[PDB]
């Protein structure tokens, strides 16, 4: 998964899924634990992958 | 991962052989009957919430100890993980049904699942029961004759049952 600066919603959500599956070691992260602000910053381009 | 075609090809390569005429006939039959397979996969996909909800209701009706304090689906987190597990297994069974091969269950869905459950302490008999209940609730939507041209799909039902039973037997 490579996520550029411009991307679509499907590419973004799939990249998020891949990131959470690897970086959290295939452990379940519930909807309450998911970082919304960090996802927003990545969506805007303020931070890279 | 393998589908049926790549599995036949891999079994032919170990022989240093081209695919035989009987193998090509079997693969032509598989593809020619593929529209029914697509209908079955769509049946699993479109009714997945219903399948999981029905199986969960039955599972926690038979086994109240899973949802008691101390049970392994007790708090919201454990129950949520249980529902994630059921959805994942059903999704992978649909993958296998599309592929005509169980290689994606062996390589992905069940690759280290028994060990996961054993280390966590999850009762694998209840997991196998959940998969059996999902099989029971999925056969109904597979056999639903509405919205599809009528035909003989007994082979698809048997294949889906083998995938569900493979998952259940690899858990327990």
């Amino acid at each position: 998964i490579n996520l550029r600066a411009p991307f679509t919603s499907e590419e973004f959500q799939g990249a998020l899924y891949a990131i959470y599956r690897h970086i959290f070691g295939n452990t379940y992260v519930m909807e309450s634990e998911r970082p919304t602000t960090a996802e927003s910053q990545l969506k805007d381009g303020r931070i890279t992958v | 991962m393998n589908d049926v075609f790549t599995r036949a090809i891999a079994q032919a390569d170990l022989k240093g052989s081209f695919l035989l005429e009987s193998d090509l006939d079997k693969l032509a039959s598989f593809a020619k009957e593929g529209v029914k397979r697509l209908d079955a996969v769509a049946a699993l996909t479109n009714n997945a919430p219903a399948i999981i909800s029905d199986a969960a209701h039955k599972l926690f009706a038979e086994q109240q100890e899973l949802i008691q304090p101390g049970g392994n689906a007790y708090p919201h987190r454990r129950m949520a993980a249980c529902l994630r597990d059921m959805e994942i297994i059903l999704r992978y069974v649909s993958y296998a049904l599309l592929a005509g091969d169980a290689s994606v269950l062996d390589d992905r869905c069940l690759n280290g699942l028994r060990e996961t459950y054993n280390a966590l302490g999850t009762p694998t008999q209840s997991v196998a029961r959940a998969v059996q209940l999902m099989k029971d609730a999925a056969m109904v939507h597979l056999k639903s004759t509405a919205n599809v041209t009528v035909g003989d799909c007994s082979s698809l039902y048997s294949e889906a049952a083998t995938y569900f039973d493979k998952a259940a037997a690899s858990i327990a």
Binding site: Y17 | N2, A8, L19, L27, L98, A99
Partner: protein, 162 residues
């Protein structure tokens, strides 16, 4: 192996989602294209010996020098290996035809091709000549779509060699 069904399943699985209409339509296209591809593979299998012998002789025609003593194309063993290699290429092309994807060629011939050819001092131009041959005769062995799938796979192998 990277085939239509396999990439469908892998892309859906990487996003943790079921198979939707897009992927089912891709699968439908594969299942419909199976008939031309499978009978093209049938035709290529039935004519393997003639194709391989013609390919070996075409390589010896476009590269006369290799036939002389002291270099690669000389000796019974070297030419038996030429025939075996060309049979390998034809076998994995028929495999790809049947599997409806470049998977078998990608995983069996193309992965590690340059390193192996470099290590054993094997010219990719020999195999390109053999595959151009096989292309020419698969033109007349096949008609309609079957010719089309066979030539996509042969040209994929040629492009991998160049």
């Amino acid at each position: 192996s990277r085939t239509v069904i396999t990439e469908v399943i892998a892309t859906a699985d990487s996003q943790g989602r079921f198979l939707n209409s897009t992927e089912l339509q891709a699968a439908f296209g594969r299942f419909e294209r199976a008939v031309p591809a499978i009978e093209a593979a049938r035709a290529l299998t039935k004519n393997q010996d003639a194709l391989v012998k013609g390919a070996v002789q075409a390589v010896f025609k476009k590269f006369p020098y290799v036939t002389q003593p002291g270099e690669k194309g000389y000796g019974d063993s070297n030419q038996a290996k030429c025939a075996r290699d060309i049979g390998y290429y034809l076998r994995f092309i028929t495999y790809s035809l049947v599997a409806s994807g470049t998977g078998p060629l990608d995983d069996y011939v193309i992965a590690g091709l340059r390193e192996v050819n470099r290590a054993f001092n094997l010219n990719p131009l020999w195999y390109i000549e053999a595959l151009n041959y096989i292309k020419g005769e698969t033109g007349k062995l096949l008609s309609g779509q079957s010719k089309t799938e066979a030539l996509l796979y042969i040209d994929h192998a040629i492009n991998a060699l160049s």
